[PDB]
Design a protein around this ligand. Structure first.
Ligand SMILES: [Mg+2]
Ligand SMILES: [Mg+2]
Ligand SMILES: [Mg+2]
Ligand SMILES: [Mg+2]
Ligand code: NA
Ligand code: NA
Ligand code: NA
Lengths: 294, 295, 295, 293
């Protein structure tokens, strides 16, 4: 046996960060100490682990195959030291979250997780669903909390909770004061202010509300929940937004919700992990925590 | 067939004037060129558009049937030229904004802009300064409101306003309880909860504070302002973040600002456009609107 | 009026081809005549119509606003030329089509249309639904026949016809021998041979089947309908694919369809056009042929 | 981690041997080197892993609890090393192909490959030669089968096989019903239905046929081999297309290939890879499989 746990950690860090420089800071080694370690691993194994893309290092065919094995070896070693000293030692997680989850759930969730584990190391990256999927796919994230569809076969979609979107408008919109239940045909000429194409929130509108209003008027598309709601509340215009974002403004008399039972505005929120990623003590403790928010 | 606008103009002028000579004067042409134009049109259509009775030209049934088509074509060519010369475009902007700007300035700014121009088409993308520079450099955005450096010669970085950052901590942080004024040395072993490498907020910290705390304990790196403040108020460490984000928490007694006059925590905010990209009237209206915003 | 139909046609072709050289071939002008046509148009209008990305030309704010007007001016000229002669001068269509449509419907469609209008100029682009939507979005296509979902606001989708997909397998598959009708549970542990993630066929499996076998083994993902069907028939494994592609093999005895009434596998096919594109005589003639070809 | 695989190996050996001496030989290590390692391990855990009897070393309770964990870690490290040294990874390939290749060669090529390697993971992207070039240049693909021309030096181009394309027409076309050897001039006035520019099949009309036909009415341009042939059979014109595509129509009487010996019309099909991309056992398997057909 030539390889060392330090070398495996460098191999993992380079796969997570993309360069020896970024990887060296993540394992707390000088840059040439890290490059010596990676070179020793590759020379000992008799093959390179990364294709050299001029600048970035990207896992090659062998590196991809070996990466999950390295993560399991490192995770068991962490479990080893834990199982001796008798409790959760080091937590080091790279997390991702989509826009609505990060605005209205992540701050409380991470703060509460750090009250219980004051020593936990957590990185947070925010993006849309497909940016999260690709990050988990590249082993760049340990876990992502997503609000969009979940359909990649090598990734695992663990249902976390359901999120209710709603059609909202200004309190003085004519449809809010209508003396009869609403119909889909009442929204034919509404001006919609929606989330960007490709986001999970926009998915719901396109797959639930666009069917009935195929010529829906959509001039404003914003990748920001608050900007949408301030414009909707600033006069006419409607949006289909998570109740997580609307309800804080319903308290301030800025918005109302229209009853639209003819449209299914559910969506599932998911925890996204790689099916091959060994779940060491760190990750697993965080997943259960997220689940135990029953 | 290969007809021309000139031929349509002569066709219409003859329809309105009755003679080639007066038609040629209307459309600013020689009698020979106008006569030639009408003949080319009729030969292209393969049938006459006028009955010929001496020098006078009278529309025949075909002429009367095609005249409104010609008038519409000529009318829309004039609208085309006027719309271009007068730059009569509607507002149709693809905008970009960095995190702190998007969170605390974009909502009211865009809401107030849409009050004046409620029919404007706008798209907004949110990301990091580096992500915005690339978008603007690829001609994917008309304008970006960034909170970071911009050292690019092909891009034009216009100064918008200033953003004041501050060091904040939970009200009972040991450093918050000191009597004397603070010094940079007091911060050597602070646990820093910071924005990611590549953000402009992290640029302020790296530029000002790191010179005095070389091995600063970067306890956490989070790409979310509120997550940072929640964790700092919860009792873990400090952050260097915009006073726009801190203030509502100061008002609620969840964060305090530590005086650090030995550190310059002022940052410029910039309007970022591509020097080679045409600027329409909508972009110029939004840029002037941003410039005219209070501070 | 200094601008000409020739210049408008160049302006359109550049928007559709992306370079002057490719535009000059589309409008059958030399490179020089084409570049001079665009430059003079821009000079007269007092502003450029395209942003320059090197040799790439992409419409700028003013160009995007004026392009629909140019298309309408040229279409009305096509209509003028035909209304006087009685017959369709130019049919000149840039068409798009998704794979299943391109594999089993377009071939006999264009061949039959070209027998009715033997003078038409047709160009056929092929791709998945995301590309046809983008291609049409840029005005690079007059019309696309798509098999996926239609969600961009600036485009319009006319319901063309329906297409029924079906789970299929080799005749000797264990699930094809059972006597008791099948359940969603029988399909646990099946090896799936599916189309690529960004296709309308994979869209049906992802939203109509995947929610019942979430751990569904998806070992092979192929952007080719025939490759899938040959692999499925050559051993075990199944796919969910259009009956247009399966049924030649079902009647050959190389595949069978498993009845799956617990899954909705019907999906619409659409005609896709830009809402801002003027529908001239040629285009409107083709759209009518496709409508009058269902039943 | 302050613990090392070396420490684990020594912790296992003493458990299997019982004395530091024999445990040192079976790990191929000096006595001092091995005793130093066990000292560090018990240090960085907080407690000892053995009871001492002069120097008989039998597992105390802690050692018995952690030993099976040490054996599993060491076993996975050994498996990790044999997997790497022997390149025992599975097949996980991202493949590309041009249109004629995808339509007429890929279906039975991939199906037969999967009869040999049934658990292989394959992905297929279909697109013209220049998309595949860039895809392989961007590491978006492990291999591409291209019917076009190779240009780049940091790409490796490997001759796969030759492809003969021919000029095809409708059987009742006047030129076909003629009883005379055709000439390059008998084509001067005829309708040509070609594939898109910048494509493999296009190269052969623009490099071989466009040297002899002056008018050369490029009546159309379609990026679909079949649509071209359905049209050509409807009575409209001719095309210079791969014979792999034509012969299916010939068995049905819809197309006839014309005699045209004054035009070469041979074009090579190539395997395309990147010179700096590590080739695992899966890629070499598929590449050799292609070459042996
Ligand atoms: Mg935010
Ligand atoms: Mg100051
Ligand atoms: Mg001038
Ligand atoms: Mg049905
Ligand atoms: Na990497
Ligand atoms: Na700035
Ligand atoms: Na110009």
């Amino acid at each position: 046996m030539r390889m060392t746990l330090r070398q495996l950690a460098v191999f993992v860090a380079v796969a997570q960060e993309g360069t020896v420089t970024k990887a060296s800071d993540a394992v707390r080694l000088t840059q040439s100490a890290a490059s010596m370690a990676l070179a020793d691993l590759e020379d000992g194994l008799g093959a390179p682990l990364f294709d050299r893309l001029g600048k970035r290092l990207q896992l090659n065919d062998l590196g991809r195959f070996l990466l999950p094995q390295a993560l399991e070896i490192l995770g068991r070693c962490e479990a080893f030291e834990q199982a001796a000293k008798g409790e959760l030692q080091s937590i080091d997680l790279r997390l991702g979250a989509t826009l609505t989850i990060s605005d209205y759930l992540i701050p409380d969730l991470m703060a509460d997780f750090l009250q219980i584990h004051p020593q936990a190391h957590l990185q947070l990256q925010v993006g849309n669903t497909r940016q999260m999927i690709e990050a988990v796919n590249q082993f760049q994230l340990d876990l992502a909390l997503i609000e969009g569809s979940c359909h990649l076969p090598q990734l695992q979609c663990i249902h976390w909770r359901n999120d209710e979107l709603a059609v909202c408008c200004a309190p003085d919109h004519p449809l809010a004061k209508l003396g009869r239940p609403l119909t889909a045909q009442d929204f034919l000429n509404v001006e919609w202010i929606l989330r960007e194409e490709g986001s999970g929130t926009r998915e719901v509108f396109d797959n639930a509300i666009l069917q009935d209003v195929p010529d829906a008027n959509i001039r404003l598309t914003l990748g920001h929940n608050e900007a949408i709601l301030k414009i909707v509340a600033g006069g006419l215009g409607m949006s289909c937004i998570s109740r997580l974002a609307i309800e804080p403004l319903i308290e301030k008399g800025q918005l109302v919700i229209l009853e639209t039972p003819f449209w299914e505005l559910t969506r599932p929120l998911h925890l996204l992990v790689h099916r091959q990623k060994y779940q060491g003590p760190g990750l697993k403790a965080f997943m259960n925590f997220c689940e135990n928010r029953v």
